[PDB]
Amino acid sequence: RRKLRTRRKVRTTTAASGRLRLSVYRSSKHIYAQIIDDSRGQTLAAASSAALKSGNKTDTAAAVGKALAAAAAEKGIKQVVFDRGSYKYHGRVKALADAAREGG
Amino acid sequence: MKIKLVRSVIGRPGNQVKTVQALGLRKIGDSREVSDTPAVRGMVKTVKHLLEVQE
Amino acid sequence: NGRDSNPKYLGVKKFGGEVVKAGNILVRQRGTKFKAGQGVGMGRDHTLFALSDGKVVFINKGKGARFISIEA
Amino acid sequence: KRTKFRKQFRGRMTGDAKGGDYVAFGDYGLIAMEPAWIKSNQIEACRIVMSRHFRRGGKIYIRIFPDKPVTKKPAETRMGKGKGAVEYWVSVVKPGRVMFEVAGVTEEQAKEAFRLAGHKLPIQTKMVKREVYD
RNA sequence: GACCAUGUCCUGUAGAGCACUCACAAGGCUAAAACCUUAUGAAACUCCGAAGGGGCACGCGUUUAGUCCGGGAGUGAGGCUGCGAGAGCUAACUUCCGUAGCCGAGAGGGAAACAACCCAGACCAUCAGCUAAGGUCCCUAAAUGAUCGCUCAGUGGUUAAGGAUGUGUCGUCGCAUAGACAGCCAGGAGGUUGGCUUAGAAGCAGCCACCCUUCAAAGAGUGCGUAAUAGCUCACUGGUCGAGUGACGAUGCGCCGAAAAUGAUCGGGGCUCAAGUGAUCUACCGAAGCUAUGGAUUCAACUCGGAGUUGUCUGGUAGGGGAGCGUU
RNA sequence: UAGUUUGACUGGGGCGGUCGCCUCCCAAAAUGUAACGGAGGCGCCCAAAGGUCACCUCAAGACGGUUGGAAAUCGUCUGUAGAGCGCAAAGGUAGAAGGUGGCUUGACUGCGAGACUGACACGUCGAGCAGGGAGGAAACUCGGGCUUAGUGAACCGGUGGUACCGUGUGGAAGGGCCAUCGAUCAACGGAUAAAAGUUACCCCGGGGAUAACAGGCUGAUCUCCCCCGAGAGUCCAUAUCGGCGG
RNA sequence: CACCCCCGUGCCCAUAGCACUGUGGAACCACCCCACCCCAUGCCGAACUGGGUCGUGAAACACAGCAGCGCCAAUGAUACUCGGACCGCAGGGUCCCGGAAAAGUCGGUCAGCGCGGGGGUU
Ligand SMILES: [Mg+2]
Ligand SMILES: [Mg+2]
Ligand SMILES: [Mg+2]
Ligand SMILES: [Mg+2]
Ligand SMILES: [Mg+2]
Ligand SMILES: [Mg+2]
Ligand SMILES: [Mg+2]
Ligand SMILES: [Mg+2]
Ligand SMILES: [Mg+2]
Ligand SMILES: [Mg+2]
Ligand SMILES: [Mg+2]
Ligand SMILES: [Mg+2]
Ligand SMILES: [Mg+2]
Ligand SMILES: [Mg+2]
Ligand SMILES: [Mg+2]
Ligand SMILES: [Mg+2]
Ligand SMILES: [Mg+2]
Ligand SMILES: [Mg+2]
Ligand SMILES: [Mg+2]
Ligand SMILES: [Mg+2]
Ligand SMILES: [Mg+2]
Ligand SMILES: [Mg+2]
Ligand SMILES: [Mg+2]
Ligand SMILES: [Mg+2]
Ligand SMILES: [Mg+2]
Ligand SMILES: [Mg+2]
Ligand SMILES: [Mg+2]
Ligand SMILES: [Mg+2]
Ligand SMILES: [Mg+2]
Ligand SMILES: [Mg+2]
Ligand SMILES: [Mg+2]
Ligand SMILES: [Mg+2]
Ligand SMILES: [Mg+2]
Ligand SMILES: [Mg+2]
Ligand SMILES: [Mg+2]
Ligand SMILES: [Mg+2]
Ligand SMILES: [Mg+2]
Ligand SMILES: [Mg+2]
Ligand SMILES: [Mg+2]
Ligand SMILES: [Mg+2]
Ligand SMILES: [Mg+2]
Ligand SMILES: [Mg+2]
Ligand SMILES: [Mg+2]
Ligand SMILES: [Mg+2]
Ligand SMILES: [Mg+2]
Ligand SMILES: [Mg+2]
Ligand SMILES: [Mg+2]
Ligand SMILES: [Mg+2]
Ligand SMILES: [Mg+2]
Ligand SMILES: [Mg+2]
Ligand SMILES: [Mg+2]
Ligand SMILES: [Mg+2]
Ligand SMILES: [Mg+2]
């Protein structure tokens, strides 16, 4: 089964560290990748791909990361924890991290 | 509440002995008035078999 | 027979409603009979000691789901 | 009555019965009045005598069973070393716990069957007929 | 500090349950493991799970202890009882732990007597008073007390399995002024000297099975009988008979069961014409406990330059401390 | 010839057994708690069974299947676990501690706030700081192993560093310190470096703290009685005898 | 929190889960789609994974009905027990006061609260 995600999301015990976590959903390339402060039941920085276009999924993903980096920097955030989903750090998601911390 | 010792403390388990002592009757035939406060009302229920509760 | 082994005075060393210094030991256990909540960190033999000074509180739905947090 | 394999030894105590206060299976039955151990052999004698009264019968459940070993110390020995090895098995029998339960035999026949089956027993007992049963 | 109350947390015992492990009770199902209905035990089994118990905090309440630091010790053989376990034989004035209390270190009243049990912790003095346990017939202090019973056994004043038309209190089942239980006369039947048996077994050794006729009236039918039938009785029938009976049951008090060694006994006398008993209620006796008057110490406050007042305290072994008396 | 050694517990001594550490029950729902009480393990292992990063999910059953068939192996369905965890068990564990690879050694040096535990002495856990490493993209995790056994103070010495003492001064001999090695000293807090019997020729000092006798308490065993009643007694349980049980 | 609905991520922590089942469709999600290479399978693009439309709501998933199952679960009555006070030689047991389960019945539920976004009534 997909015991990848409960495992990786129990390994964010370091939400006790105070950093926010950055969920990603390499599914339909919907890769919405929310930023969450877990303590409240609250999310703070959405970046859904509704009509961003940008072409092939591996590069639209980096576009989603570079746009969300601004979308969260507006509110005043910089500590980061990359709560990957079940997905590997394989590239199409790795571009999201590269472009996200390229412009925190 | 009126209280009077009419039982010896001898030979009775030591919680009852420190209970009568803090009640402040050190000898049988002692009496005293007492507050209605639940703390002391339970202090007297604990050793009611030693005392004559009057009120 | 006639053999036996030393006591290991294990337990809930600090009960909920007890202020604790950092590094106080609060539960002793063979394993994770307690699973350590926020502020607490669990050692090698799975004793869990508070990291932060404050009150001790028990999260406890039970059945292996009992956790010890500390509130400042 | 003997238990085919176990762990070796036990202990003892008593308080009133919580398993088998009501009869099933049979027509009539018999109940303890006194707490006690009962040996395998006391059972087997009740079986022998109630099978004497029940020729070609087959209505003899034995709703009790020697579970507990009890181990006397050997010949003449001063104390020291274990409980020897088990000398006989016994069944705890607290009051109100049924022992016996017949069917298919008329009231006075079961009544005599229970007379003899109790007289070999080390306890008071009583015959009962079933009706206040859920 | 200590007890007690509130708040909170932690626990896996009693109990209780089979959901796992071992065990185990009657069946159905089936190449029997498995499975289902039903049924159970478990120190090393737990789906559960109190009472209590421990830590914290408060004191929202009565009390007086505690903590550390320095001098001196002794003790490191425990004993019983009750509760909870182990070991034992559910033995022991047994042995080993937990726990409470007494004894050790404890006087006084009770238990005839008696470290441990029940009452009650002795500062001193009194020819003063109330009580505790326990008592009130004489010994022997104090009701031959009162009221409803219970037991006629000296039970009381030594056990049990088991028996008993012993006796009260309720209580369940039948058949009766269309007249029953014992109780007297009257009948005892039919194939049938019934199948199944050993050598004969024929109400009436005994394994297997009980229907059918003639009847106001009787079961191929009870215990006896010689080895078999008769034989006197019985279960239904009847003139009489004239009113209750018989059954298992719960129980209260008793009987038997119930033999040991120098001489008997409840402590003794004696007790039912209660001095036994269960239920109630008083009235008094009854301690070195409590109260009264007097008296002195330990401590502490309170006053004057140990004294005195008020409170309080004063059983005591090893021991620690303190004030003093006697001899050279 | 001589001076000595020759262990303790022990329902009396001897014999047998035991002596240290771990697990469970006893242990009476805190911690603790005895027994020659009931059960069983340890005197090690692992260059990866570590650190880290990443990835898989186990028994067992049924239907189906090649030489195998109750159980090799593959295939489907059910499958909070009925498996596994190096050895014993309890706890624990399914988001892993179980299984499988890549990298490397934190199986580091210097420290230790705070506590748990113990009469001590030992023992346990431990956040975070330095120097510097290792894995990861990072958060982060590493100063051994899921945990609890795998162990012995102190003395006297071996080996490598270091440059403190080193006797008049300079050196060296020797010593100190840091590291490490030598222990069934297992009677496992460990009397010496170095040790067995025997006494009925016995002697002393003690003990009813403790056996042989006798009394006592108990009454398993012993002696006796009673209940039942199977059968024996042709017949008929009880004239006698009375199984198995109480 | 205008009304629904979807993707995700929390709190909760079986009264939320199972099964039977019906709705769902290019809006969302999901399989199918191809593989020399990023990247990978101790064999397989099944899994990760990279390049995408059709197709299809089949399967999975979401959401409703659903009391066969599970899950919860009284009251009442006990068991037991703190203190008090008793009987039995003994195993054992009783009484007064107060605390009081477990099992079972009665009955309850196929949940309940957020946060961000996506597309709807245009
Ligand atoms: Mg018990
Ligand atoms: Mg039951
Ligand atoms: Mg043994
Ligand atoms: Mg206080
Ligand atoms: Mg039990
Ligand atoms: Mg306790
Ligand atoms: Mg305060
Ligand atoms: Mg001192
Ligand atoms: Mg001693
Ligand atoms: Mg003792
Ligand atoms: Mg025994
Ligand atoms: Mg003794
Ligand atoms: Mg002794
Ligand atoms: Mg003494
Ligand atoms: Mg004393
Ligand atoms: Mg006395
Ligand atoms: Mg006496
Ligand atoms: Mg006298
Ligand atoms: Mg004496
Ligand atoms: Mg004396
Ligand atoms: Mg005595
Ligand atoms: Mg008394
Ligand atoms: Mg008087
Ligand atoms: Mg009186
Ligand atoms: Mg007189
Ligand atoms: Mg009797
Ligand atoms: Mg009179
Ligand atoms: Mg009077
Ligand atoms: Mg007097
Ligand atoms: Mg006096
Ligand atoms: Mg005076
Ligand atoms: Mg004194
Ligand atoms: Mg005094
Ligand atoms: Mg004195
Ligand atoms: Mg010796
Ligand atoms: Mg304990
Ligand atoms: Mg002791
Ligand atoms: Mg791991
Ligand atoms: Mg650290
Ligand atoms: Mg570092
Ligand atoms: Mg790196
Ligand atoms: Mg050297
Ligand atoms: Mg030596
Ligand atoms: Mg030693
Ligand atoms: Mg000589
Ligand atoms: Mg002497
Ligand atoms: Mg002696
Ligand atoms: Mg002797
Ligand atoms: Mg002899
Ligand atoms: Mg109730
Ligand atoms: Mg009470
Ligand atoms: Mg009690
Ligand atoms: Mg009650």
Curated annotation (Swiss-Prot), chain A:
One of its GO terms (molecular function) is 5S rRNA binding. The keyword Signal does not apply. Keywords: Ribonucleoprotein, Ribosomal protein, RNA-binding, rRNA-binding. Pfam families: Ribosomal_L18p. CDD domains: Ribosomal_L18_L5e (cd00432). Belongs to the universal ribosomal protein uL18 family. Part of the 50S ribosomal subunit; part of the 5S rRNA/L5/L18/L25 subcomplex. Contacts the 23S rRNA. Contacts protein L27 and the 5S rRNA. This is Large ribosomal subunit protein uL18. It comes from Deinococcus radiodurans (strain ATCC 13939 / DSM 20539 / JCM 16871 / CCUG 27074 / LMG 4051 / NBRC 15346 / NCIMB 9279 / VKM B-1422 / R1).
From Swiss-Prot, chain B:
GO terms for biological process: translation. Belongs to the universal ribosomal protein uL30 family. Binds the 5S and 23S rRNAs. It holds the Pfam family Ribosomal_L30. The keyword RNA-binding applies. The keyword Ribonucleoprotein applies. InterPro entries: Ribo_uL30_ferredoxin-like_sf, Ribosomal_uL30_bac-type, Ribosomal_uL30_ferredoxin-like. It comes from Deinococcus radiodurans (strain ATCC 13939 / DSM 20539 / JCM 16871 / CCUG 27074 / LMG 4051 / NBRC 15346 / NCIMB 9279 / VKM B-1422 / R1). Part of the 50S ribosomal subunit. GO terms for molecular function: rRNA binding; structural constituent of ribosome. One of its GO terms (cellular component) is cytosolic large ribosomal subunit. PANTHER family: LARGE RIBOSOMAL SUBUNIT PROTEIN UL30M, MITOCHONDRIAL RIBOSOMAL PROTEIN L30. It comes from the Bacteria. Keywords: Ribonucleoprotein, Ribosomal protein, RNA-binding, rRNA-binding. This is Large ribosomal subunit protein uL30.
Swiss-Prot record, chain C:
Disulfide bonds: none annotated. One of its GO terms (biological process) is translation. One of its GO terms (cellular component) is cytosolic large ribosomal subunit. One of its GO terms (molecular function) is structural constituent of ribosome. Keywords: Ribonucleoprotein, Ribosomal protein, RNA-binding, rRNA-binding, tRNA-binding. Binds the 5S and 23S rRNAs and also the tRNA in the P site. Part of the 50S ribosomal subunit. Contacts protein L18. Belongs to the bacterial ribosomal protein bL27 family. This is Large ribosomal subunit protein bL27. It comes from Deinococcus radiodurans (strain ATCC 13939 / DSM 20539 / JCM 16871 / CCUG 27074 / LMG 4051 / NBRC 15346 / NCIMB 9279 / VKM B-1422 / R1). The chain holds residues 12 to 83 of 91 of the full protein.
UniProtKB/Swiss-Prot annotation, chain D:
GO terms for molecular function: rRNA binding; structural constituent of ribosome; tRNA binding. It holds the Pfam family Ribosomal_L16. The keyword Transferase does not apply. PROSITE patterns: RIBOSOMAL_L16_1, RIBOSOMAL_L16_2. Signal peptide: none annotated. GO terms for cellular component: cytosolic large ribosomal subunit. InterPro entries: Ribosomal_uL16, Ribosomal_uL16_bact-type, Ribosomal_uL16_CS, Ribosomal_uL16_dom, Ribosomal_uL16_sf. Keywords: Ribonucleoprotein, Ribosomal protein, RNA-binding, rRNA-binding, tRNA-binding. GO terms for biological process: translation. Binds the 5S and 23S rRNAs and is also seen to make contacts with the A and P site tRNAs. Interacts with A site tRNA mimics, and is probably one of the key factors, along with a helix of the 23S rRNA, in positioning tRNA stems in the peptidyl-transferase center. HAMAP family: Ribosomal_uL16. Part of the 50S ribosomal subunit. Contacts the CTC protein (RL25). Belongs to the universal ribosomal protein uL16 family. This is Large ribosomal subunit protein uL16. The gene is rplP.
